[PDB]
Amino acid sequence: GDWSALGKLLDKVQAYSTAGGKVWLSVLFIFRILLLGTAVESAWGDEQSAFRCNTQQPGCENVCYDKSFPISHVRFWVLQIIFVSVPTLLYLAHVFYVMRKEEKLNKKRGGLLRTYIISILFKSIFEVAFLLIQWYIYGFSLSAVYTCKRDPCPHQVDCFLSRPTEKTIFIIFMLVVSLVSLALNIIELFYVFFKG
Amino acid sequence: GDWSALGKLLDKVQAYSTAGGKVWLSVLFIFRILLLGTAVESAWGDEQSAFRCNTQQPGCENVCYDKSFPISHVRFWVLQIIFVSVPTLLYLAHVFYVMRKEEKLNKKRGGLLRTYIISILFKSIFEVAFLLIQWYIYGFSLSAVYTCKRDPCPHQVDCFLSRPTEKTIFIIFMLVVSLVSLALNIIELFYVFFKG
Amino acid sequence: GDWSALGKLLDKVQAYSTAGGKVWLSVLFIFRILLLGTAVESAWGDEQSAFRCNTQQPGCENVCYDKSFPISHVRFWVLQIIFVSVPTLLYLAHVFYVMRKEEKLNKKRGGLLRTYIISILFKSIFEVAFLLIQWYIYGFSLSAVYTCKRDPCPHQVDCFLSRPTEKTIFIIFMLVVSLVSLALNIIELFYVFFKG
Amino acid sequence: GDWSALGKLLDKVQAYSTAGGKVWLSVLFIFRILLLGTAVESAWGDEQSAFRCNTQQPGCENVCYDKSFPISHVRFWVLQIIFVSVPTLLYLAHVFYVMRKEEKLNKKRGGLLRTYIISILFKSIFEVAFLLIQWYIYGFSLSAVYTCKRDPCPHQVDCFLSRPTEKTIFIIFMLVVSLVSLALNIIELFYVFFKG
Amino acid sequence: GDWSALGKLLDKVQAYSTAGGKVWLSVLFIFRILLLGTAVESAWGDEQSAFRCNTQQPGCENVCYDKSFPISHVRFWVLQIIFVSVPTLLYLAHVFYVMRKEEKLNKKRGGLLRTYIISILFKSIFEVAFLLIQWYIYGFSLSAVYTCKRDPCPHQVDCFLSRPTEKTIFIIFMLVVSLVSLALNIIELFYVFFKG
Amino acid sequence: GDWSALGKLLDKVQAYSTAGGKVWLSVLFIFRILLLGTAVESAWGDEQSAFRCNTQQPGCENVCYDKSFPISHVRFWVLQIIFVSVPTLLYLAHVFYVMRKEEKLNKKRGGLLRTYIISILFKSIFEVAFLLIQWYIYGFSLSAVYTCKRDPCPHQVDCFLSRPTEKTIFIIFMLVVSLVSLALNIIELFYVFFKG
Which chains lie within 8 Å of chain E at 3 or more CB pairs, if any? A, F
Residues 159 through 178 of chain D touching chain F, CB cutoff 8 Å = 160-166, 169
Through-space distance between the first and last CA atoms of chain D, rounded to whole angstroms: 40
Number of inter-chain CB pairs under 8 A, A vs B: 64
Asked if A90 and E43 come within 8 Å (Cβ–Cβ), the reply is no
Interface probe, candidates E74, E75, E77, chain F, greatest F C-beta count within 10 A? E75
The residue type found at C169 is I
The residue type found at A81 is I
Cis bond before residue F58 (omega within 30° of 0): no
Distance CA B189, CA B119 (A): 11
Sequence-distant (≥ 6) Cβ neighbours of residue A192 within 8 angstroms? A16, A17, A117
The residue type found at C121 is L
Residues 36 through 55 of chain A touching chain B, CB cutoff 8 Å = 38-40, 42-43, 46, 50, 52, 54
User: Which member of B49, B75, B93 has the closest CB to residue A23?
Assistant: B93
In this structure, which long-range contacts are made by residues E166-170, counting pairs with CB atoms below 8 Å and at least 24 apart in sequence?
A: E166/A66, E166/A69, E166/A70, E166/A71, E166/A72, E166/A75, E166/E43, E167/E43, E167/E44, E167/E73, E167/E142, E168/E141, E168/E142, E169/A71, E170/E39, E170/E40, E170/E43
The residue type found at E41 is E
| Residue of chain D minimizing CA distance to F67 | D165
The residue type found at C38 is T
DSSP code per residue over B47-77: TTTS-EES--STTHHHHHHHHH-SS-HHHHH
| Residue E161 CB-half CA count within 13 A | 21
Asked if B144 and C82 come within 8 Å (Cβ–Cβ), the reply is no
If you count them, how many residues does chain A have? Answer: 196
D63: number of Cβ within 10 Å: 22
> What was the structure determination method?
cryo-EM
Buried b (16+ CB within 10 A) or exposed e, F45-59: eebbebbbbebeeeb
Q: What SS3 class is residue E53?
A: strand
- The distance from CA F68 to its chain's CA centroid, rounded to whole angstroms, is 22
Distance CA E110, CA E114 (A): 6
In order of A113, B162, C147, the CA distances from A109 in angstroms are 8, 67, 85
What single DSSP character describes residue E46? T
- Chain F contact set for D2 (CB, 8 A): 2
Distance CA C68, CA C75 (A): 15
DSSP code per residue over chain A: ---HHHHHHHHHHTTTS-HHHHHHHHHHHHHHHHIIIIIHHHHTTTTTTS-EES--STTHHHHHHHHH-SS-HHHHHHHHHHHHHHHHHHHHHHHHHHHHHHHTTTT---TTHHHHHHHHHHHHHHHHHHHHHHHHHT-S---SEEEE--SSS-S-EEEE-S-TTHHHHHHHHHHHHHHHHHHHHHHHHHHHHTT-
- Chain E contact set for F50 (CB, 8 A): 48, 62
| Residue of chain C minimizing CA distance to B55 | C58
Distance CA B178, CA B167 (A): 17
In order of D192, D193, F58, the CA distances from D15 in angstroms are 11, 15, 61
Judge residue D60's burial from the number of C-beta atoms within 10 Å of its C-beta, 0-12 exposed, 13-18 middle, 19 or more buried: buried
B62 CB near a chain A CB, below 8 Å?
yes
DSSP code per residue over C173-196: HHHHHHHHHHHHHHHHHHHHHTT-
Distance CA C6, CA B178 (A): 33
Judge residue E50's burial from the number of C-beta atoms within 10 Å of its C-beta, 0-12 exposed, 13-18 middle, 19 or more buried: middle
Residue D27 · residue C27 · CB < 8 Å: no
Write down the domain spans for chain D.
3-194
Rg (CA), chain F: 23
Asked if E93 and F43 come within 8 Å (Cβ–Cβ), the reply is no
Buried b (16+ CB within 10 A) or exposed e, D101-125: eeeeeeeeeeebeebbeebbebbbe
Residue F161 · residue E62 · CB < 8 Å: yes
Q: What SS3 class is residue F136?
A: helix
| Residue of chain C minimizing CA distance to B169 | C71
Judge residue E143's burial from the number of C-beta atoms within 10 Å of its C-beta, 0-12 exposed, 13-18 middle, 19 or more buried: exposed
Closest to B111 measured CA to CA, from B96, B95, B124: B95
Superfamily of domain A3-194 in CATH is Gap junction channel protein cysteine-rich domain (1.20.1440.80)
Distance CA F62, CA D52 (A): 9
A10 CB near a chain B CB, below 8 Å?
no
| Residue of chain D minimizing CA distance to F86 | D27
Asked if C1 and D2 come within 8 Å (Cβ–Cβ), the reply is yes
Rg (CA), chain C: 23
Helical packing angle, B113-137 and B166-193, nearest 10°: 150
Longest dimension (CA), chain D: 80
Asked if E166 and A71 come within 8 Å (Cβ–Cβ), the reply is yes
User: Which member of D63, D78, D79 has the closest CB to residue C144?
Assistant: D63
State the virtual CA torsion across F25, F30, F35, F37 in degrees, nearest 10: 140
Residue D36 · residue D74 · CB < 8 Å: yes
| Residue of chain D minimizing CA distance to F3 | D1
Q: What SS3 class is residue D97?
A: helix
* φ/ψ of residue D160, rounded to 5: -115, 130
Task: List the resolution, Å.
Answer: 3.6
Gapped junctions in chain E, after residues (C–N > 2.5 Å): 108
- Chain B contact set for A164 (CB, 8 A): 66
The residue type found at B94 is H
Distance CA E55, CA E159 (A): 9
Asked if E144 and A66 come within 8 Å (Cβ–Cβ), the reply is yes
